[PDB]
Amino acid sequence: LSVAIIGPGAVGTTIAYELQQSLPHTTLIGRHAKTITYYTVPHAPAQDIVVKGYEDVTNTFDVIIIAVKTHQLDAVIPHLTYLAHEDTLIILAQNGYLEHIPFKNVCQAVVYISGQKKGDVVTHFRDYQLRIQDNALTRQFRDLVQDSQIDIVLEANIQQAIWYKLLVNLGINSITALGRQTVAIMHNPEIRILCRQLLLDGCRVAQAEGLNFSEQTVDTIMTIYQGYPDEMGTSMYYDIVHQQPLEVEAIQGFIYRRAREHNLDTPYLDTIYSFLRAYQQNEG
Amino acid sequence: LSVAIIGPGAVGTTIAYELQQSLPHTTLIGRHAKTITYYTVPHAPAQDIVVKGYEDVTNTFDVIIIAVKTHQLDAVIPHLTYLAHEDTLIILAQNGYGQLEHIPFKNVCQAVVYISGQKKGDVVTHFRDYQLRIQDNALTRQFRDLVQDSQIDIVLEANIQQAIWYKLLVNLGINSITALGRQTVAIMHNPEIRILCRQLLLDGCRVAQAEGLNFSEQTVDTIMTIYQGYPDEMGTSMYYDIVHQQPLEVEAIQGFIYRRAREHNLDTPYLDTIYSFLRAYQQNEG
């Protein structure tokens, strides 16, 4: 069973490194060939991991994990024609919420792996977990990686897990990015009020999509946010302050488009999405 | 009838220059004596404008026009003890609202400012317009008459509340959007932004109504129409302030509207969201 990871970033390098410890043929693919210097944890002995460029990879793979940013998926897609066969299992190790991918077996994963890439140096911080829809192919993949540190959690129905992370992202990523601030911005009472209202907007969309969320869910997420230290950023905050594109369309945009589909009133979500969309269009 | 302007900036210098053309004893006052540069329009020949420092002034004025930013008003107030007599007409030529009561004088009036210009250091460039709108009363009628030979257009309003709130809304929509968006008005080419803009104006309208103003969806439409006339490169003062990492005039504008919304227990989600971010910026910069 052949395995590729596409996207040698924080998440992709972590997955490739750890899978290569038990499955040494596992292949890490980027735009061009290079070598990433990888730390399993901060201050660990450095480890180099080989990246093959698209042009270097001639064969097809049974499993392909895509770990690029959501706004980078469209650029990856055409390469799949040569990297995958009709039955290749394709796993999106990305945030947000597939139909753009012209293959039968495409699965959206929920990523619980924390790390950062600076230049060609990747530092993993904590966690090795992917939550994926439980099916024949993902069970087979789970079995394949059993001697690695990668924790594949199979969900009888992956929608709840996807939407839960969608909501966790929705509140604090929107606020820190639009606010151009670390999570310390939550010390403003008005910002916390906004954050809860924004989560409530997201929650009512999740509900109309058939998910079992509620005000309790919002309380739980606000409680998680209270645990974050002041200096903590979010991925969308880092992207906006470094003038990079945002993952907005697959996160706030997805939630927004579902809100409209259900004719919901979501003023907080709408406001947040309008500004993040405007940023994205300016960056284009 | 003597006139002073406090605040040698875009608005204050425009008013001083034009009033000095017909009322040469009109005095422009700043923190320190200097001579600044004024352009009547861009590329016009420079005009020297004399600025007297507070320490130089040894007389009172019958009319004092305060032309500073909203958050700068508190620092001006103690100087009025030395510049005004009991009956002095004080005109607060300033955006926002809710600050008139801070001025301990009986004759205090807001002016709604329709004068466009920019101050950079000691250089003021006027762009267009020369209008102030002020409540109609005996003292403002006397002031209007005084300045009749100048280019300054004093419009006396039967009820100044309307003009004040109209301007609050005009600021509320495009200044919040450009500032939070960190963009010129070109940001309005995004249809989602125009939808938000209109919803934001509607929140503002609902607050105005609770304050007793006859604003409606027609009012909102007229303001959206005005926005459609702005060229892409145009900024707003709040936009310029936020990109310059300066304090904003938020507390007397979006802040005031927000506090009135809470006072009336209204549901104003767009306004609340906008204010929450502008306030967070202000708390971080301060």
Ligand SMILES: NC(=O)C1=CN([C@@H]2O[C@H](COP(=O)(O)OP(=O)(O)OC[C@H]3O[C@@H](n4cnc5c(N)ncnc54)[C@H](OP(=O)(O)O)[C@@H]3O)[C@@H](O)[C@H]2O)C=CC1
């Ligand atoms: N802690 C984390 O980092 C977490 C991340 N996630 C999610 O995981 C996903 C990946 O995030 P993350 O690893 O942080 O992102 P990174 O920016 O660290 O990695 C993305 C990688 O993909 C590469 N890439 C970009 N375009 C292409 C392309 N067309 N073909 C091949 N490779 C490409 C980039 O290369 P280049 O350097 O040249 O741009 C970069 O190496 C995101 O959706 C994120 O939201 C979720 C939880 C935590």
Ligand SMILES: NC(=O)C1=CN([C@@H]2O[C@H](COP(=O)(O)OP(=O)(O)OC[C@H]3O[C@@H](n4cnc5c(N)ncnc54)[C@H](OP(=O)(O)O)[C@@H]3O)[C@@H](O)[C@H]2O)C=CC1
């Ligand atoms: N186009 C425009 O400029 C328009 C402005 N307005 C409104 O008019 C008001 C004035 O704005 P604008 O003229 O642009 O602002 P400016 O910053 O151009 O002018 C403010 C001036 O007041 C001076 N000042 C500040 N504090 C004091 C003090 N304690 N004592 C004496 N002088 C002081 C400042 O000094 P220093 O030079 O040292 O900073 C500056 O010269 C604002 O509320 C604005 O929203 C309304 C419509 C248009």
